[PDB]
Amino acid sequence: TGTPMMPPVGVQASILSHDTIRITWADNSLTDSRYYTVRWKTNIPANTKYKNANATTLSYLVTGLKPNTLYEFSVMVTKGRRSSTWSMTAHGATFELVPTSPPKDVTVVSKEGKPRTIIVNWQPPSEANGKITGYIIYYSTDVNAEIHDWVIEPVVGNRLTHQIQELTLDTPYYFKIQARNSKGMGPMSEAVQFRTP
Ligand SMILES: O=S(=O)(O)OC[C@H]1O[C@@](COS(=O)(=O)O)(O[C@H]2O[C@H](COS(=O)(=O)O)[C@@H](OS(=O)(=O)O)[C@H](OS(=O)(=O)O)[C@H]2OS(=O)(=O)O)[C@@H](OS(=O)(=O)O)[C@@H]1OS(=O)(=O)O
Ligand SMILES: *[C@@H]1O[C@H](CO)[C@@H](O)[C@H](O)[C@H]1NC(C)=O
Ligand code: NA
């Protein structure tokens, strides 16, 4: 007992998924009663509570993380009544994930002059889990029709407005929107009803 113990060296983060980052380290001061405690927290906001975990090996797999999120990691060694201060901090940002929220605040308005033309306006989804690459607008004269029967209107790029031309006058029309990121298409919005003049 010649207190205190040397904190871990060579702390490294390895990105595995949208929710998994693998932490490895080195223990120069090396079967006995000792154990490591891994701590992690989201880089932003500045003040956040740390999550902890015990590990007997010189590795720990941090699970259940937020997608497209940057985390701070540290390790410490605990042996009996002795302990090491926290190690050097390692950083890792989880992979992206398909959006898991639909585009929000969807609105449909007729184009000034041209009534067979409508302007769809929306907002990005909350749970976007990555950079929005684009959107897909679906529309029908039957809200009950299967998604494949609906008219497909791709919206290339992260624009929040789109124009649809050549539609039937004085007709109820229904509108759904879904978002896109590198990992695929996220959910669709609830159908919004708009009757043409
Ligand atoms: O001297 S005693 O055997 O009575 O135990 C007290 C402390 O010895 C240390 C080092 O201090 S010193 O020997 O008094 O100078 O043990 C730590 O280092 C040696 C090997 O390194 S050395 O400096 O080249 O001698 C290891 O073996 S041993 O001499 O203790 O038998 C230790 O490995 S072990 O984990 O104890 O099995 C090593 O301890 S540790 O990895 O740091 O926990 C003190 O530790 S130190 O000051 O942090 O380096 C010993 O305290 S202890 O709690 O009894 O281990
Ligand atoms: C680690 O185990 C120690 C007992 O060995 C306990 O005090 C501590 O709360 C455990 N931590 C976690 C997060 O499992
Ligand atoms: Na993306």
Q: Are 177 and 188 in contact (CB under 8 A)?
A: yes
Contact 67, 95 (CB under 8 A): yes
DSSP state of 183: T
Ligand 2 center–CA 54 separation, angstroms = 6
Q: For this experimental structure, what is the resolution in angstroms?
A: 3.2
105, 146 Cβ separation under 8 angstroms: no
Residues 6 or more apart whose CB falls under 8 angstroms from that of 151 comprise 138, 139, 140
Probe ligand 2: pick from 32, 37, 51, 60, max atoms within 8 Å of CB? 37
Distance CA 67, CA 90 (A): 18
Asked if residue 5 has its Cβ within 6 Å of ligand 1, the reply is: yes
- Which residues are CB-contacts of 22 (< 8 A; sequence separation ≥ 6)? 13, 14, 16, 59, 60, 61, 62
**Method used to solve the structure:** X-ray
* Listed residue (15, 126, 22) closest to 69, CA to CA: 15
Q: Is 28 in the pocket of ligand 1 (CB under 6 A)?
A: no
- Chain center to CA of 184: 12
| C-alpha–C-alpha distance, residues 151 and 58, integer Å | 55
Closest CA relative to residue 52, chosen from 44, 92, 60: 60
**What are the structural domains, with CATH classification, of the chain?**
1-98 (2.60.40.10), 99-197 (2.60.40.10)
Q: Are 147 and 115 in contact (CB under 8 A)?
A: no
